[PDB]
Design a protein around this ligand. Structure first.
Ligand SMILES: CC(C)(COP(=O)(O)OP(=O)(O)OC[C@H]1O[C@@H](n2cnc3c(N)ncnc32)[C@H](O)[C@@H]1OP(=O)(O)O)[C@@H](O)C(=O)NCCC(=O)NCCS
Ligand SMILES: NC[C@H]1O[C@H](O[C@H]2[C@H](O)[C@@H](O[C@H]3O[C@H](CO)[C@@H](O)[C@H](N)[C@H]3O)[C@H](N)C[C@@H]2N)[C@H](N)[C@@H](O)[C@@H]1O
Length: 172
């Protein structure tokens, strides 16, 4: 069972290592330690309405995740959003030897549950790139539905949603 804790300043050097592992680099640019400290400091992320978490498994950190207020995004992101209740997610697994063993699906399921525990939250979104079939499949298994293609400042994305109603019906 995978759980989530908030990321702290103390996790930044570990995150920096992960973001230079080649299984991560291919989908996530190759940040220096200072890049990571400037960009992923929780109080800096806070300014773009981003919350970082660390995924835990048997007491060990196994990945990184982010939630964000879509409406709170700016610089070209989700310009058409009108609903303050929408959240987006992103995530990664730290260890290549743990890829494709269902852990990503548990991580996403844990992150979806936490977010719907914000009573103001209406819907979760994700935006994997079209090439990223493994991320798209993992999200599907976690209850996300493919809507269609959207343009983002990083490029096209397969836009996927899970509503609160859908979550209510499947959680049992
Ligand atoms: C995305 C990520 C979190 C998913 O976690 P994961 O543990 O690998 O995914 P899961 O094991 O839970 O399931 C993934 C599914 O993708 C499928 N799959 C793997 N590679 C695939 C491919 N190239 N094409 C189609 N399906 C693929 C698997 O079959 C599996 O589903 P299954 O149970 O039906 O067999 C993880 O792979 C990761 O950190 N990747 C690197 C960075 C990244 O892509 N982050 C996401 C950015 S949107
Ligand atoms: N899925 C994996 C992807 O995760 C991140 O992409 C995220 C952005 O982080 C997030 O943007 C937020 O953080 C930015 C700072 O980076 C701010 O500009 C922005 N205002 C703020 O809303 C978008 N809303 C959603 C997008 N999927 C990585 N960057 C990218 O490399 C990787 O492929």
């Amino acid at each position: 069972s995978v759980t989530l804790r908030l990321m702290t300043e103390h996790d930044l050097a570990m995150l920096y290592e992960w973001l230079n592992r080649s299984h991560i680099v291919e989908w996530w640019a190759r940040p220096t330690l200072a890049d990571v400290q400037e960009q992923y400091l929780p109080s800096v992320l806070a300014q773009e309405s981003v919350t970082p978490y660390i995924a835990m498994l048997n007491g060990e950190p196994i990945g990184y995740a982010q939630s964000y207020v879509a409406l709170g995004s700016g610089d070209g992101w989700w310009e058409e959003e009108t609903d303050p209740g929408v959240r987006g997610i992103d995530q990664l697994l730290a260890n290549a030897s743990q890829l494709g063993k269902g852990l990503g699906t548990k991580l996403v399921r844990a992150l979806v549950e936490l977010l719907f525990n914000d009573p103001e939250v209406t819907k979760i979104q994700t935006d994997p790139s079209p090439s990223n079939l493994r991320a798209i499949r993992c999200y599907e298994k976690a209850g996300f539905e493919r809507q269609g293609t959207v343009t983002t400042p990083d490029g096209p994305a397969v836009y996927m949603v899970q509503t609160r109603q859908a979550f209510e019906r499947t959680r049992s």
